[PDB]
Design a protein around this ligand. Structure first.
Ligand SMILES: Nc1nc(Nc2ccc(S(N)(=O)=O)cc2)nn1C(=S)Nc1c(F)cccc1F
Length: 298
């Protein structure tokens, strides 16, 4: 009998995490399923209200989920947003944890554009991981579109007061997933646009290889674990990380060498991948590896 706002019925748990809970919802007024992200009001470290402001700042973008509502819901703050499909991580599992180059390239082309969009709205994303990239709903007009989701860790990298790029600094506690995060993120540096692009590169390599060569590093503290992973990242030449994928190596070398304040050349990066895509005789037809598989649905 729980409701969010005038018209959103809260249904079954379709997920949870440190963030709180994901529920299937229904807009009763429109007969449409929605996703309802719930954060306990009692939360130390609220991030749902921030995230809602980020989405409003992103506005309606290609591959940006629509957000319908922010408001209270029993002992939770609730954000009603577009019900999307499976994550790239869930899809990766469906596809035996390797994607074809065609798939990774279709993903990468889209995601460079997504990131560029986020960046054009003066946001850095700072939580690149396969779990935060969702296809649209099986059957929907956007099932083929890779969406970017979860802006809880985002930040305005252009200060709205000054309209200047945020300053460089270090001693930043680490933001994002260890596996994909930029080398500079490991070093406690302020993240900027480069770091989102580098994280994507890492994730692309994950998709292509099946794994990254710094997965499963154990340490006694989370700080030591992050440190070892970043050490391994620094110790692993792009040449061997991206062996057999010359354009990924080029992408990764480029993003890693970006200056803190530097506007990435997204056109260049897209073209590395679109020129590759074309040389391989791939057709951008959204025939991803997971097409014709039974996709999980709430
Ligand atoms: N907006 C949205 N739609 C969906 N769709 C979804 C969720 C679960 C499943 S399931 N239950 O694995 O089949 C399928 C599609 N998930 N979703 C969100 S916001 N997922 C999500 C996320 F992608 C990252 C962090 C927290 C979350 F709640």
């Amino acid at each position: 009998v729980l409701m969010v706002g005038p018209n959103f019925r809260v249904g079954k748990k379709i997920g949870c995490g440190n963030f709180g809970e994901l529920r299937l919802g229904k807009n009763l007024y429109t007969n449409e399923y929605v996703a309802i992200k719930l954060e306990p009001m009692k939360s130390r470290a609220p991030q749902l209200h921030l995230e809602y402001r980020f989405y409003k700042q992103l506005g309606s973008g290609d591959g940006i989920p629509q957000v319908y509502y922010f408001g209270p819901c029993g002992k939770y703050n609730a954000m009603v947003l577009e019900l999307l499909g499976p994550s790239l991580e869930d899809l990766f599992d469906l596809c035996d944890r390797t994607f074809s180059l065609k798939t990774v390239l279709m993903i990468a082309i889209q995601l460079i554009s997504r990131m560029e969009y986020v960046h054009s709205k003066n946001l850095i994303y700072r939580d690149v991981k396969p779990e935060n990239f969702l296809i649209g709903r099986p059957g929907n007009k956007t099932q083929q579109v890779i969406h970017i989701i979860d802006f809880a860790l985002a930040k305005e990298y252009i200060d709205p007061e000054t309209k200047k790029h945020i300053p460089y600094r270090e001693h930043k506690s680490l933001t994002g997933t260890a596996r994909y995060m930029s080398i500079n993120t490991h070093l406690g540096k302020e993240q900027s646009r480069r770091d989102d692009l580098e994280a994507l590169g890492h994730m692309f390599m994950y998709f292509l290889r099946g794994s990254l060569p710094w997965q499963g590093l154990k340490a006694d503290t989370l700080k030591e674990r992050y440190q070892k992973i970043g050490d391994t990242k620094r110790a692993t030449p792009i040449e061997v990380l991206c062996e057999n994928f010359p354009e990924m190596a080029t992408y990764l070398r480029y993003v890693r060498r970006l200056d803190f304040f530097e506007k990435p050349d997204y056109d260049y990066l897209r073209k590395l991948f679109t020129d590759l895509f074309d040389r391989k005789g791939y057709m951008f037809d959204y025939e991803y590896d997971w097409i014709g598989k039974q996709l999980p649905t709430p």
